[PDB]
Amino acid sequence: MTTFRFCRDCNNMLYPREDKENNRLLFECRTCSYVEEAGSPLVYRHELITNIGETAGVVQDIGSDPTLPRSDRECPKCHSRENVFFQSQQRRKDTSMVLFFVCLSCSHIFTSDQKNKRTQFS
Amino acid sequence: FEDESAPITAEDSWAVISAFFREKGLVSQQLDSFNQFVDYTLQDIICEDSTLIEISFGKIYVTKPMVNESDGVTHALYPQEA
Amino acid sequence: LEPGHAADQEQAKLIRSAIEHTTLKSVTIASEIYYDPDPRSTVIPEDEEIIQLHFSLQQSPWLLRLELDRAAMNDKDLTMGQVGERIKQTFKNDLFVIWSEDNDEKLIIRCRVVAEEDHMLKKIENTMLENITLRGVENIERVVMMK
Amino acid sequence: ILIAMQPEDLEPDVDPAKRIRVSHHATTFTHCEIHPSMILGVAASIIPF
Amino acid sequence: DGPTMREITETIAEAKKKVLDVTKEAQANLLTAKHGMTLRESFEDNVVRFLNEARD
Amino acid sequence: PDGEILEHICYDVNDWQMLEMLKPCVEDGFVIQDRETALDFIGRRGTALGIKKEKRIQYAKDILQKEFLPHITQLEGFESRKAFFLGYMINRLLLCALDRKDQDDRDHFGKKRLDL
Amino acid sequence: LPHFSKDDYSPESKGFVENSYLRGLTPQEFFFHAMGGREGLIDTAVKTAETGYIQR
Amino acid sequence: GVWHGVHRNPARLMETLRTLRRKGDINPEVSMIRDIREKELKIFTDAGRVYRPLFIVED
Ligand SMILES: [Zn+2]
Ligand SMILES: [Zn+2]
C-alpha cells in the first residue's frame, strides 16, 4: 500500500527525494518546483503472495447476477441467509478454492476460509 | 379447459420447434444472411465512396433472375432450367 | 537414496529440500523499500528490537526490507542465518545485510546499499527475489517423493 | 444467464430404468432450453438414441 | 442385475460424497497442498481419482 | 498531466498495485510534456527525417484520428473517447498482468463470428 | 455450461458421466462426452499423422 | 465494441434493454450482456454472432 501523490499545481507524478540535512523524506515533482514531505516512509512494496483482487467484482448488483451460486450460510453482521458466493477472483493457479459470499441484505463480504488472516478483504 | 396459462410440458417444446422451423426453415442462416445483403448491405456499398473527384451513384434495383441470351430475348430464368 | 537410508521418510525429505531449487522469491512474503535514514533508531517498530540485537557479543538511508514466510521458510529446512549470509555472500560488501533471528515472530532481512539509490535497490531487490539460490540444484523445480 | 435443461427443471421412487439427472437447485433461471436434442446438427439429428 | 444397479448407483453416489467432502474441505482451506502441487492442482487430482475409483 | 492519464487507465485510487505497475510508464513518457511534443514524437516514428514539424504533427494527428482505434470515431472531436478506450485497454492488459485476470479464451465462441 | 451456476466444482458440472450408455446420457453428460470424444478423434488424427511419419 | 460511456444504475438500463428487445422495439438478434462483476454492459448488433433461441423464464 504505497498510496502515492501527484503535485498540487501541475498534477504530474511525485518522486521521492531525501532531505540530506534533517534526514527525512521529501517528494519533489520534476515538472513544477512543488515538493511535499512524505506520509509513510514506504516508497515501494512488492506483494509476492497477493490478496487484492480477491474481492474485486463486489457490486451493488452482485446478487442480481443470476449465474452466481446461492447458499444459505449466515453473515457475521446481519445473519441473513440471502448469500451469493464466488471463488477468489484473482486468477492465479496458487489460489485456494476459498469461497467469498456477499450478503445481499447488508452487502457484506464474508469467507469460507477457516484460516482468516485479513480484516477488509480489499 | 386446457388452461391457457397452464405451464408448458417437455412435450410441448416440439410445437415451439415446429413453429421455429415453419417460419425459418432449415437454411435461414443462408437466406437471411443473403437477404440482408440484397435488401440493405447492397445499397449501403453503393453509398460509401459514391463520390469521385463528379458522378454520384444513388438507388439500386435488383431484377428478377434473367439470362443473357446469345441470339434472343433477355429471358425469365428459372432455377431448374438454369 | 543411498542404500542405508531408504526408508527414512525424513532423509528423503532432507535430500528433497537440499535438491529442490529454492529461491529467495519462494520464501519472501513481501519486499519494501523504506526511507529509513538513521542506522540506529528506525521508523519501523518491528525492527527496533532487531537493530538492538545486532549490537552485542557507508550505508544509504534507503532500506530494502524483506518479510519472509516461516511456512515455506522451515519447510525448505532454512535458517534466517542461512538465507541471510547467502545474500551477504551474493552481494559481497556491496550490500549491508542484517536479519531478524529465528525466534522473532516476523522474519526480516534488512538491506542497504553500501544519490540514485531507490533505483539500484529495486534492481537488487530483484537480483534477490529472482537470482539468489538459498538452497538446491538449479533447474530442479518440483521434487516429489514417492514410495 | 442460467438455463434450465428441461422446463420441468423449474418445478419447485425414481425409475431405476431412468438415467440419473442433476438436481434443480436454483431459483435463478433466466431461460430454459426449448429442447436439448436441438444441440445437434442435421447429420446427428438422424442418429437414434 | 436390478440390485447390482443399486450397488452401482450407490458406488457412484458414494464417490460424490468423497468429492463433496474434499470440496468442502478445500473451500474451507483445510486441504494441504501436496508438496510441489497447488491446492487446485491437488484437489482435482483427488476428485479425478475418486471418480475413477468409482467408475472402476 | 500524469494524474489525468492515470485516471484514464486506473479507475481506482487505492489500486496502488496497478498504478505502481505504471510508475515506469509515467517515467517512460517523461521527456514529453505537451500534446505537440507528443504528437511530434509519434509523427517522427511515422515519418522520414526530412519532414517538417507541422507536417509531422499533422501526420500523427491524422493517424490518431483515423488509424488508431478507428472503430470508435474517424472524425475529429473524439480524443477523450480514444484516450478512455486506450486507458481501458492498458487497464485490462495490466489487470491480466497483475495475475488478477485470466488471459482471454481465444476459443470462446461468443467472440467468434460466422461469415455467411 | 450456461446450465450450471458459477464456481460449480461438482462431478456433474466438471464432467463425470454418471450414467451407463445403456441408461443414456444427460445433455450435459452428452456434450461433455462429446468434448472428451472430440479430444479422442482430434489426437487420434494426430497419433495417426505423427506415427505415420515416425514409422517412415 | 465501442465504449460509449457509463451508466450508474445499469440493471435499470438492463431491464429496459431486455424489455425493448422482448417487445420487438430493439431487434431480437441484438445481444446484450451485462457482466455484473466487471462493471460492463456490452451490447452487440453486428452480424456474424451465432445465436440460438431459448425459453424465457421470468419471475
Ligand atoms: Zn508539479
Ligand atoms: Zn451480512
Short mmCIF file of N, CA, C and O in Angstrom, two decimals, chain G:
data_model
loop_
_atom_site.label_atom_id
_atom_site.label_comp_id
_atom_site.label_asym_id
_atom_site.label_seq_id
_atom_site.Cartn_x
_atom_site.Cartn_y
_atom_site.Cartn_z
N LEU G 1 -20.98 -25.00 -18.32
CA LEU G 1 -22.09 -24.76 -19.23
C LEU G 1 -22.96 -23.62 -18.69
O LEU G 1 -22.86 -23.27 -17.51
N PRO G 2 -23.81 -23.03 -19.55
CA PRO G 2 -24.62 -21.95 -19.02
C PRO G 2 -25.79 -22.50 -18.20
O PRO G 2 -26.67 -21.75 -17.80
N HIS G 3 -25.75 -23.81 -17.95
CA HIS G 3 -26.78 -24.52 -17.22
C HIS G 3 -26.39 -24.82 -15.79
O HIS G 3 -27.16 -25.43 -15.07
N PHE G 4 -25.18 -24.44 -15.39
CA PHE G 4 -24.76 -24.61 -14.01
C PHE G 4 -24.64 -23.24 -13.42
O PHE G 4 -24.74 -22.26 -14.14
N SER G 5 -24.43 -23.15 -12.12
CA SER G 5 -24.11 -21.85 -11.54
C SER G 5 -22.61 -21.65 -11.60
O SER G 5 -21.87 -22.60 -11.79
N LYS G 6 -22.17 -20.40 -11.48
CA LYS G 6 -20.75 -20.10 -11.40
C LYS G 6 -20.05 -20.79 -10.23
O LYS G 6 -20.63 -20.98 -9.17
N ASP G 7 -18.80 -21.18 -10.46
CA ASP G 7 -17.96 -21.89 -9.50
C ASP G 7 -18.55 -23.20 -8.95
O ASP G 7 -18.49 -23.48 -7.75
N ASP G 8 -19.08 -24.00 -9.87
CA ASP G 8 -19.61 -25.30 -9.54
C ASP G 8 -18.56 -26.35 -9.84
O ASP G 8 -18.36 -26.68 -11.01
N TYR G 9 -17.92 -26.89 -8.80
CA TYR G 9 -16.85 -27.90 -8.96
C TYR G 9 -17.26 -29.36 -8.73
O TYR G 9 -16.42 -30.21 -8.50
N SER G 10 -18.56 -29.63 -8.82
CA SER G 10 -19.10 -30.97 -8.61
C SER G 10 -18.74 -31.85 -9.78
O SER G 10 -18.41 -31.33 -10.83
N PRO G 11 -18.80 -33.19 -9.61
CA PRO G 11 -18.59 -34.11 -10.72
C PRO G 11 -19.52 -33.83 -11.89
O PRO G 11 -19.06 -33.69 -13.02
N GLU G 12 -20.82 -33.73 -11.60
CA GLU G 12 -21.83 -33.47 -12.62
C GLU G 12 -21.47 -32.28 -13.48
O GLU G 12 -21.71 -32.29 -14.67
N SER G 13 -20.90 -31.25 -12.87
CA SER G 13 -20.61 -29.99 -13.55
C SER G 13 -19.37 -30.10 -14.39
O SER G 13 -19.36 -29.76 -15.56
N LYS G 14 -18.32 -30.60 -13.76
CA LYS G 14 -16.99 -30.64 -14.30
C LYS G 14 -16.76 -31.89 -15.18
O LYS G 14 -15.65 -32.13 -15.64
N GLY G 15 -17.80 -32.69 -15.39
CA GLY G 15 -17.82 -33.68 -16.48
C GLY G 15 -17.77 -35.17 -16.21
O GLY G 15 -17.26 -35.94 -17.02
N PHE G 16 -18.28 -35.59 -15.06
CA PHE G 16 -18.40 -37.01 -14.76
C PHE G 16 -19.64 -37.49 -15.46
O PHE G 16 -20.74 -37.01 -15.17
N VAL G 17 -19.51 -38.41 -16.40
CA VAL G 17 -20.74 -39.00 -16.90
C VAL G 17 -21.12 -40.07 -15.91
O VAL G 17 -20.39 -41.05 -15.74
N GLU G 18 -22.23 -39.85 -15.22
CA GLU G 18 -22.71 -40.75 -14.18
C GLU G 18 -23.27 -42.03 -14.81
O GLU G 18 -22.97 -43.13 -14.35
N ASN G 19 -24.05 -41.87 -15.88
CA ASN G 19 -24.79 -42.98 -16.48
C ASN G 19 -24.03 -43.98 -17.33
O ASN G 19 -23.02 -43.65 -17.94
N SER G 20 -24.53 -45.22 -17.37
CA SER G 20 -24.10 -46.17 -18.39
C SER G 20 -24.59 -45.69 -19.74
O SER G 20 -25.40 -44.78 -19.81
N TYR G 21 -24.10 -46.30 -20.82
CA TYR G 21 -24.58 -45.95 -22.15
C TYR G 21 -25.92 -46.58 -22.31
O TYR G 21 -26.75 -46.03 -23.01
N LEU G 22 -26.13 -47.72 -21.66
CA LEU G 22 -27.45 -48.33 -21.63
C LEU G 22 -28.49 -47.36 -21.09
O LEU G 22 -29.57 -47.23 -21.65
N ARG G 23 -28.17 -46.69 -19.99
CA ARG G 23 -29.09 -45.76 -19.37
C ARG G 23 -29.31 -44.50 -20.18
O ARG G 23 -30.33 -43.83 -19.99
N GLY G 24 -28.37 -44.18 -21.06
CA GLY G 24 -28.43 -42.93 -21.81
C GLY G 24 -27.77 -41.81 -21.04
O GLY G 24 -27.69 -41.87 -19.83
N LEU G 25 -27.31 -40.80 -21.76
CA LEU G 25 -26.53 -39.71 -21.16
C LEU G 25 -27.36 -38.45 -21.09
O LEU G 25 -28.09 -38.16 -22.03
N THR G 26 -27.27 -37.68 -20.01
CA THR G 26 -27.90 -36.37 -19.99
C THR G 26 -27.27 -35.44 -21.04
O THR G 26 -26.14 -35.66 -21.44
N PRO G 27 -28.00 -34.40 -21.48
CA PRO G 27 -27.46 -33.44 -22.45
C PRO G 27 -26.08 -32.89 -22.08
O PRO G 27 -25.20 -32.79 -22.94
N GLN G 28 -25.89 -32.54 -20.81
CA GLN G 28 -24.59 -32.11 -20.34
C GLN G 28 -23.68 -33.30 -20.51
O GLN G 28 -22.70 -33.21 -21.24
N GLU G 29 -24.02 -34.43 -19.88
CA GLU G 29 -23.19 -35.63 -20.00
C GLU G 29 -22.93 -35.86 -21.46
O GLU G 29 -21.81 -36.20 -21.83
N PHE G 30 -23.95 -35.65 -22.29
CA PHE G 30 -23.83 -35.93 -23.71
C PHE G 30 -22.85 -35.00 -24.34
O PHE G 30 -22.09 -35.42 -25.20
N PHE G 31 -22.87 -33.73 -23.93
CA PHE G 31 -22.00 -32.74 -24.53
C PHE G 31 -20.59 -32.86 -24.01
O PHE G 31 -19.65 -32.58 -24.75
N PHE G 32 -20.44 -33.25 -22.75
CA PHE G 32 -19.12 -33.45 -22.13
C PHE G 32 -18.49 -34.70 -22.65
O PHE G 32 -17.27 -34.80 -22.77
N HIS G 33 -19.33 -35.67 -22.93
CA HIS G 33 -18.85 -36.86 -23.54
C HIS G 33 -18.40 -36.50 -24.93
O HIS G 33 -17.37 -36.98 -25.39
N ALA G 34 -19.15 -35.62 -25.58
CA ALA G 34 -18.83 -35.20 -26.92
C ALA G 34 -17.50 -34.48 -26.90
O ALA G 34 -16.74 -34.59 -27.85
N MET G 35 -17.23 -33.76 -25.81
CA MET G 35 -15.99 -32.98 -25.66
C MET G 35 -14.82 -33.93 -25.54
O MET G 35 -13.82 -33.80 -26.25
N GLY G 36 -14.95 -34.90 -24.65
CA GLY G 36 -13.92 -35.88 -24.46
C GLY G 36 -13.72 -36.63 -25.75
O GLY G 36 -12.61 -36.94 -26.14
N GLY G 37 -14.83 -36.89 -26.43
CA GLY G 37 -14.82 -37.64 -27.67
C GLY G 37 -14.03 -36.90 -28.70
O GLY G 37 -13.11 -37.44 -29.28
N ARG G 38 -14.38 -35.64 -28.92
CA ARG G 38 -13.67 -34.84 -29.88
C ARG G 38 -12.18 -34.80 -29.55
O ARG G 38 -11.37 -34.82 -30.46
N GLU G 39 -11.81 -34.76 -28.27
CA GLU G 39 -10.38 -34.82 -27.90
C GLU G 39 -9.77 -36.10 -28.47
O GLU G 39 -8.79 -36.04 -29.19
N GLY G 40 -10.41 -37.22 -28.18
CA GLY G 40 -10.04 -38.50 -28.76
C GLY G 40 -9.78 -38.51 -30.26
O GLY G 40 -8.69 -38.89 -30.68
N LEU G 41 -10.77 -38.09 -31.06
CA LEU G 41 -10.63 -38.14 -32.52
C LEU G 41 -9.57 -37.16 -33.00
O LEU G 41 -8.81 -37.48 -33.92
N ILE G 42 -9.54 -35.97 -32.41
CA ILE G 42 -8.57 -34.94 -32.77
C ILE G 42 -7.17 -35.48 -32.68
O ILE G 42 -6.41 -35.36 -33.63
N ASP G 43 -6.81 -36.06 -31.55
CA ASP G 43 -5.46 -36.57 -31.46
C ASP G 43 -5.38 -38.04 -31.82
O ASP G 43 -4.30 -38.62 -31.79
N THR G 44 -6.49 -38.64 -32.20
CA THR G 44 -6.39 -39.88 -32.95
C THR G 44 -5.93 -39.51 -34.34
O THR G 44 -5.28 -40.30 -35.00
N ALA G 45 -6.25 -38.30 -34.77
CA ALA G 45 -5.75 -37.83 -36.06
C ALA G 45 -4.29 -37.40 -35.95
O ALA G 45 -3.54 -37.47 -36.92
N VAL G 46 -3.89 -36.95 -34.75
CA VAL G 46 -2.50 -36.56 -34.50
C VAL G 46 -1.63 -37.81 -34.45
O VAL G 46 -0.67 -37.92 -35.21
N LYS G 47 -1.97 -38.75 -33.56
CA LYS G 47 -1.29 -40.04 -33.47
C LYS G 47 -1.18 -40.74 -34.81
O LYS G 47 -0.16 -41.34 -35.10
N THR G 48 -2.22 -40.67 -35.64
CA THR G 48 -2.11 -41.28 -36.95
C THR G 48 -1.06 -40.54 -37.79
O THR G 48 -0.18 -41.17 -38.38
N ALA G 49 -1.10 -39.21 -37.77
CA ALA G 49 -0.26 -38.39 -38.65
C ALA G 49 1.22 -38.38 -38.26
O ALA G 49 2.07 -38.49 -39.14
N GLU G 50 1.51 -38.25 -36.96
CA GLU G 50 2.89 -38.29 -36.42
C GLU G 50 3.47 -39.70 -36.48
O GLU G 50 4.60 -39.88 -36.92
N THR G 51 2.69 -40.68 -36.04
CA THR G 51 3.09 -42.07 -36.12
C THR G 51 3.36 -42.47 -37.56
O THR G 51 4.33 -43.18 -37.86
N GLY G 52 2.50 -42.02 -38.46
CA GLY G 52 2.68 -42.28 -39.88
C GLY G 52 4.09 -41.93 -40.31
O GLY G 52 4.73 -42.70 -41.02
N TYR G 53 4.57 -40.78 -39.84
CA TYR G 53 5.84 -40.24 -40.29
C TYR G 53 7.04 -40.76 -39.47
O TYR G 53 8.12 -40.96 -40.03
N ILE G 54 6.86 -40.97 -38.17
CA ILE G 54 7.88 -41.65 -37.36
C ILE G 54 8.26 -42.98 -38.01
O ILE G 54 9.43 -43.21 -38.30
N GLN G 55 7.27 -43.83 -38.26
CA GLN G 55 7.49 -45.14 -38.86
C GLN G 55 8.29 -45.06 -40.17
O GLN G 55 9.10 -45.92 -40.44
N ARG G 56 8.06 -44.00 -40.95
CA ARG G 56 8.80 -43.75 -42.20
C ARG G 56 10.22 -43.22 -41.94
O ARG G 56 11.10 -43.32 -42.81
#
